[PDB]
Amino acid sequence: VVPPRSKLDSILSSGLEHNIDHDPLEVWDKGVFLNELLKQGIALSTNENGTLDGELVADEGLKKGSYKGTRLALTEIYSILEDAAVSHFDKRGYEPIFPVKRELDLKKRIYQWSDGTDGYPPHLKVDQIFDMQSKIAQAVSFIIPKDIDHENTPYKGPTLADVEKFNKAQFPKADIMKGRNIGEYDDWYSDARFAQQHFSGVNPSTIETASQDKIKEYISEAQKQGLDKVKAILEDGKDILIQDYSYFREATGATNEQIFQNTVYELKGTTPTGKTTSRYAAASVVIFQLHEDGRLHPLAITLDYKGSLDNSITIFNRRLSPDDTCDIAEKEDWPWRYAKTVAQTADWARHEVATHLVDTHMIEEAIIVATNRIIPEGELLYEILSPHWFRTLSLNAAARKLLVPGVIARIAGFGPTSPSLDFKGNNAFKLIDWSYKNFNFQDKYIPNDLKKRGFDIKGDKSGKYKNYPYANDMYLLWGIIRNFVKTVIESQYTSDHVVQKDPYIGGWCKEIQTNGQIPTFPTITTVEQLIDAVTMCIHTASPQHTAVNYLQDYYYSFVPAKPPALCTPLPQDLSALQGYTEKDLTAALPIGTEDMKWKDWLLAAQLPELLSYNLITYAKSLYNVNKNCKTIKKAAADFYSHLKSAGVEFENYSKGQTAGTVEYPVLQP
Amino acid sequence: VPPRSKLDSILSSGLEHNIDHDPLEVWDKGVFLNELLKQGIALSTNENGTLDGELVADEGLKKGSYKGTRLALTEIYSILEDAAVSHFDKRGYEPIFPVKRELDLKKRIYQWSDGTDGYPPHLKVDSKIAQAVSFIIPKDIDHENTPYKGPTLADVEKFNKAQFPKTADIMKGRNIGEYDDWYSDARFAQQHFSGVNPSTIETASQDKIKEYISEAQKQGLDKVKAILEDGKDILIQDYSYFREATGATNEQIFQNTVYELKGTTPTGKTTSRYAAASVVIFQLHEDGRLHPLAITLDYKGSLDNSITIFNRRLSPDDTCDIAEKEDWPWRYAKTVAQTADWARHEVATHLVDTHMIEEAIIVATNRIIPEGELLYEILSPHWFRTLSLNAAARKLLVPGVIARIAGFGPTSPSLDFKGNNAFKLIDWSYKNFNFQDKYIPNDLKKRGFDIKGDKSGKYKNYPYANDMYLLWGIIRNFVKTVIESQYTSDHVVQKDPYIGGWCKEIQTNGQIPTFPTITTVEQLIDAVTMCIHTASPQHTAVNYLQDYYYSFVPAKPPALCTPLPQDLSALQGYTEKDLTAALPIGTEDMKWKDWLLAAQLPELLSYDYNLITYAKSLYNVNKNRFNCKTIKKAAADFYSHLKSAGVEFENYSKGQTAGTVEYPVLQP
Ligand SMILES: [Fe+2]
Ligand SMILES: [Fe+2]
């Protein structure tokens, strides 16, 4: 044998077999990271007695870093804040960790309404890190060094072809799709793949039938540009759809003559340095047409809709049909690619703010709070709803404290500036307020939502909805959750009067409509209204949130496919836009070593991991504890069977898409 | 085919899937928290918000299923840990978001407990939770398709194999049952070198050898006597200190009478579990195979006063008339010794020697060294979330599980935690720990192994020893490079403002007198190496294959389900039924509950967690502005060597004699 004293010596004495630099950091050792924060003064300061100051320790933030280290640093600090939140909510008893029995009267003292002065819609009033409720938002600009090595980063460029190349090199190799992005497709820019996102990407649920009036406007704007075939297509008017972001102005208080801009101040600790960076945004409008075979096809994009099409800049597609051929390949149609990117920035905002944050997280929270204030724990409604809300309130607070003012409001183009002293005077937050105000609980029950946005998913046998798997899956899933809810709710609620004389349903509806500020929540008096509202809550908690968030990384990670905002002003008119080139597009995306664009790319690629990083386990758990609980038992067995049966159907709607179309695995049990 | 037609065909048609064929794997956390409520497995409160002291439920659960109760315990435990983690954040014992705190404020926060709780000294934290585990374990369960049902060994062996995941980390998901000869002497003794307690076996002394030489002559056994007399490499694993450590007299029997509570009051039904202060003598052959020779069931002061049985096989290759499989007395003896090891491992080697000593050192460090300092900066990462977890263990794991399934008693549950034998055992283990003797090189030398120099290959089946010699020196080298960046001569150590009181704090309040009084750089290097040793690889060696070794309970049961035999003659007439009766197999005598807890303890103790991520994290923060340039190269070198060592641990594993279970446990 070689003895162990010889093996030891040969390892210590000989050169190194393995060079650390060839092995990049994948996740921080938690202990080491917490320390480095300390050493850097990225930490809360305190007085002799133990109480907080209000301030951090470090006066300035970090100097140097590397995209990969800063990327993971943001992630870790965020996950720290969430634990901090979780722990804080345990102490207060907003979400206790070890269960606690609490009368309904003590819960009214614990669960209170915030008052709107933090700048948010109504939520749990919150009041160690959440005791001074800003200083945490500080700590994120402190982790983002003032400059980083730009070599071997995903934004360096200088061209799209460069960042495409880099993107693919970072891929590993349904389960898979998680670990790649839309860059995997060489034609990530294609009209087909662009519009497809309005049916099966992260915001599948806001596109709607275009109205006769809008159609008329574009018929008129088409005529002005001497474009006869477009005019005909529109005038004939068969299945014209619209995705309409023009409400950005209405929702921020913007006038039609004002331009969306976010001037970003470089701070040195807290004071500015003089250096600024502007990001720009737009209240775009896309008109599409949906063909018989199923392919949604884009016809027109209005970059920023300023009151009328006369006052705006509309560009029409050279291809009038998925199969049309122009002399200029889609790849080199730069104005149109610019237009498409612009519309993508609009969708980023509407998705992130309204469809994700507002329509799943913040409405749900108003309902969580009201439920705890109004229904005692023993009751059926409580018993059925509460499992879907676990650890939800604490997470919503991290988002409020840090995610919106630190990231969403930093990389948007709404401004007016960043950072911002008051969040009431900040456009992102007004946009959140408006989304909240204009949410309609009932209109968003799946069957009403499709019918209203104008889709006969339910009955159509033509196959023109085969490329709308969100719709097809959700019709089916919604009815399966409903059926479950029904079997359970009907075990006690045997006629509409049991609902009408329930001691709690009445004030619950009231609490929500008023303090919760969701007037569109039903005033429940029927069993069918009770079934539907509860189905919407389970819908909102699991599958809607999962549809709207699970492929967030896939769609945003490769920033050129769907950038948060523009890095340059919009063109001054149509003529300018028609002369756009690859450089005009590229300038407007966060690519290169200049204008703090790396910081934008960094945050834009990170947001998914910060927002990301099921119903069978539910059904299975429910069946086991319940072994009228005999009715609750069979309801959960049946529910289990049907979700499985549906899984096969979602994989069919995914396959049944037209050829080449990206998969839709998002609702797999 | 529209979605209204798919919906109808799913609702109307019979069920395509039957839930019972798809067994619960993990609880939906929301549902479970609710059930606890509905069942009153929850803390009660007054109108104002303050606690009562009591739970809600008067009684515990009635009905359940092994799988659901298995996972229920797991969940409730993980809940308690979060509760702990959250509670330590509020108090500021382990803040989650960092905060800067002067050394004088930390003395107010980090205080010494006072021994009143029955434990050795630990962080002072500022019996209704133990209640809540007996409440989650229903008073009866469906016994069909469970791993204890039996009625025979051959039945529970058959079941065990069927639950293996379907076809290193493989090994994670399976247990020693995988081997048909799990009962074999070879596999039994091998555990004393490469199973969860590899580090307590030692050379037998001339006096012990003499006792067994005498007891051998009494039984007319001449070849054994010769082997022992010749005396070449005789080793011992000696649990006889169980009595000394509990205050037991030689004329008292280890027993734990288990009271069935109906809420809080007993029902009259009781169940006894029994334990023993066994002693195994082994002999270690030239080829490398440790072989057992004698087992003393319960050493009562002298061998005259005890019951020793000697192996019929005097050698790994020996053949008797009776196959190992049907040598029932000897299989009984071996199981008995296994119960001894379970206790020593769980109490001393795991919870005392890694978790509780470490905590005393964590507390002293925060009381004595300011955060900025080097020692603080290098030690603290290895202690992440450790204190909160030690508290869960104190509140619930020891009184609820370890003290329930042991045979030390005297009863369970127990009002008094002092005067509970399990705790006295923990007190004694803590007292008799020797920090310095357990530095790896001293630990091998002391237990009597020339691992360091041997070229014969008689330690080729001791991969813990071989790996640890090598790992210990790699961690030391790292520690040295770092410690020497500021500690350049023994005087820097002698005039340090903090190392002096740190050593004192630990020796006194921490009650580890065996901690060095550090005045040299080499004493500083060694102590820090031991702390990293204790935090990562020792803890990993003694805990990572806990599931492998314990989850098939007959291979290593926590305690006996029946008294020991009244004398040697009785034992020699033992049969399969005598063994089986003494293991937790069957529907009766609350044995399912013991099997349940015994198989669960690993999952409760076994819960982003290694030295490579460490080295890699350290390298990266020290690439931007002691000397950080020296700390950088130290962590690069450390990384390279751990990887280079990984190959050497896989060699020591392969280099074992043929058929010997793998030892993947220290893989980076
Ligand atoms: Fe979300
Ligand atoms: Fe442990």
CATH class wording of the domain at 443-546 and 614-669 in chain A: Mainly Alpha
Number of strands of chain A: 10
Spatially, the strands of the biggest sheet of chain A line up as 3-4-7-8-9
Supply the CATH architecture of the domain at 443-546 and 614-669 in chain A: Up-down Bundle
CATH topology of the domain at 443-546 and 614-669 in chain A: Lipoxygenase-1, domain 5
Radius of gyration of chain A, rounded? 26 Å
The main pleated sheet of chain A reads as:
5 strands, antiparallel
Largest contact between protein chains?
A: A-B, 108 and 109 residues
What fraction of residues of chain A sit in β-strands? Answer: 5-15%
How many individual helices of chain A?
Answer: 26
Q: Oligomeric status of the shown chains? A: homodimer
Structural class of chain A: alpha+beta
Query: What compounds sit in this structure?
Result: fe (ii) ion
Q: What is the CA-CA span between the terminal residues of chain A?
A: 55 Å
State the share of residues found in helices of chain A, binned by percent: 40-55%
> CATH superfamily assignment of the domain at 443-546 and 614-669 in chain A?
Lipoxygenase-1, Domain 5
Dominant shape of chain A:
globular
EC number (chain B): 1.13.11.45
Catalytic activity (chain B): (9Z,12Z)-octadecadienoate + O2 = (11S)-hydroperoxy-(9Z,12Z)-octadecadienoate
InterPro entries (chain B): LipOase, LipOase_C, LipOase_C_sf
Enzyme class (chain B): oxidoreductase
